[PDB]
Design an enzyme around this catalytic site. Structure first.
Site, mmCIF file in Angstrom:
data_model
loop_
_atom_site.group_PDB
_atom_site.id
_atom_site.type_symbol
_atom_site.label_atom_id
_atom_site.label_comp_id
_atom_site.label_asym_id
_atom_site.label_seq_id
_atom_site.Cartn_x
_atom_site.Cartn_y
_atom_site.Cartn_z
ATOM 1 N N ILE A 1 0.856 -1.178 0.000
ATOM 2 C CA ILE A 1 0.000 0.000 0.000
ATOM 3 C C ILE A 1 0.893 1.229 0.000
ATOM 4 O O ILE A 1 1.832 1.333 0.798
ATOM 5 C CB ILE A 1 -0.948 0.000 1.206
ATOM 6 C CG1 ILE A 1 -1.763 -1.295 1.262
ATOM 7 C CG2 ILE A 1 -1.860 1.206 1.119
ATOM 8 C CD1 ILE A 1 -2.449 -1.659 -0.014
ATOM 9 N N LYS A 2 0.607 2.157 -0.902
ATOM 10 C CA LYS A 2 1.401 3.362 -1.095
ATOM 11 C C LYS A 2 0.753 4.511 -0.340
ATOM 12 O O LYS A 2 -0.447 4.785 -0.503
ATOM 13 C CB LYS A 2 1.502 3.615 -2.596
ATOM 14 C CG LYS A 2 2.358 4.756 -3.057
ATOM 15 C CD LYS A 2 2.900 4.364 -4.424
ATOM 16 C CE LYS A 2 3.361 5.550 -5.221
ATOM 17 N NZ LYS A 2 3.888 5.114 -6.543
ATOM 18 N N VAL A 3 1.548 5.166 0.507
ATOM 19 C CA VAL A 3 1.081 6.151 1.450
ATOM 20 C C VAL A 3 2.019 7.360 1.328
ATOM 21 O O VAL A 3 3.227 7.210 1.500
ATOM 22 C CB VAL A 3 1.133 5.607 2.896
ATOM 23 C CG1 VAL A 3 0.868 6.706 3.901
ATOM 24 C CG2 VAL A 3 0.168 4.432 3.085
#
EC number: 2.2.1.2
Length: 352
Positions: A138-140
């Site tokens: 997941i890219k945050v």
């Protein structure tokens, strides 16, 4: 030639594709890339906006989803999650072959959550469960709230791509948050060996911001110098006794990932960023055209740690000129969030 990708792997760097689409996977192209040396995939809202607009295979999917009572965001998510899950399936063999160290596919949370730590955690946990693959990240965005979320997500055992980093200081804050999450898990007797985090440090945007007003000897040099210094910071942080105590127990180091590595100024060779940033325990995610250029006429050499002294001298001259790279980094991160939100709104409009 193509073997350059395996030559770069031997220097310790993975090359990921900074693109994703339904046809990329369905055509078998991604599977062939994952045999030819490509080691992973990144996406972001702009990549999806362009893919949804240009890839014919989305038309039937959109028509089907417009028959259901769904918000535009859930139509987008259904599409994007499906693409990511299909890509993860293509990359799984690679991922498993390395003990889970390669073969990742990244999906970014909604830009509107970037300053909301709790909301980011909630969405990241949900998207992680929706994709349902061990090789999804997941890219945050690495805002202050994103670094808070990173600690929580790591403590939950979730692999994360922390993005929109332009600052050495913020990157070091991210490492500290990672280590706190890891230490939490170890204290609780939970596993850490499959948790992987990358820190996506952006390259071309720095030069695009500064070059028109810099002196000759500095044009096209700042972003590389900043990355070289970031990598030196990385070596110092992860070899220190504090982290070594965690690595002895199975923790993985965060790895720097060079992003925005397509060259945006025709005054510079198209392989400049890829050629200049190769070193051990790093990743470089490249758009298709840059991957093409690197295969055709790139060079595989361990350049990232070369001439660190000159990188330091260049950053000192940048400061002498009154360019505060920490102020710049905050602006570039803000601008990137605005641009990703713009792309996200553009892609949602046809999904109404």
């Amino acid at each position: 030639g193509m073997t350059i990708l395996s030559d770069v792997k031997a220097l310790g760097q993975q090359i990921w594709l900074d693109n994703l689409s339904r046809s990329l996977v369905q055509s078998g192209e991604l599977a062939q890339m994952l045999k030819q040396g490509v080691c992973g995939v990144t996406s972001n809202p702009a990549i999806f906006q362009k893919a949804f607009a240009g890839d014919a295979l989305y038309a039937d999917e959109v028509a089907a989803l417009k028959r259901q009572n769904l918000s535009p965001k859930q139509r987008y998510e259904t599409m994007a999650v499906a693409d990511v899950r299909a890509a993860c399936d293509v990359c799984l063999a690679e991922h498993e072959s390395t003990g889970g160290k390669t073969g990742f596919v990244s999906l970014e949370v909604s830009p509107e959550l970037a300053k909301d730590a709790q909301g980011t955690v909630e969405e990241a946990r949900r998207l992680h469960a929706a994709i349902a693959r061990k090789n999804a990240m997941i890219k945050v965005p690495a805002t202050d709230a994103g670094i808070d979320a990173l600690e929580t997500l790591v403590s939950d055992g979730i692999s994360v791509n922390l993005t929109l980093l332009f600052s050495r200081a913020q990157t070091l804050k991210a490492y500290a948050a990672y280590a706190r999450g890891i230490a939490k898990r170890l204290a609780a007797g939970q596993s850490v060996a499959h948790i992987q985090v990358v820190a996506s440090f952006f390259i071309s945007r720095v030069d695009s911001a500064l070059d028109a007003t810099l002196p000759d000897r500095l044009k096209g040099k700042t972003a590389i110098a900043l990355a070289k210094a970031a990598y030196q910071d990385w070596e110092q942080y992860f070899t220190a006794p504090e982290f070594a105590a965690l690595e002895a127990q199975g923790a993985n180091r965060v790895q720097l990932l060079w992003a925005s590595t397509g060259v945006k100024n025709p005054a510079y060779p198209d392989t400049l960023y890829v050629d200049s940033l190769i070193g051990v325990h790093t990743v470089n995610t490249v758009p298709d055209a840059t991957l093409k250029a690197f295969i055709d006429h790139g060079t595989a050499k361990a350049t990232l740690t070369e001439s660190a002294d000159e990188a330091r001298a260049r950053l000192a001259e940048i400061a002498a000129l009154g360019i505060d790279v920490e102020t710049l980094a905050a602006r570039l991160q803000e601008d990137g969030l605005k641009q990703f939100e713009e792309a996200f709104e553009k892609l949602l409009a046809p999904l109404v």
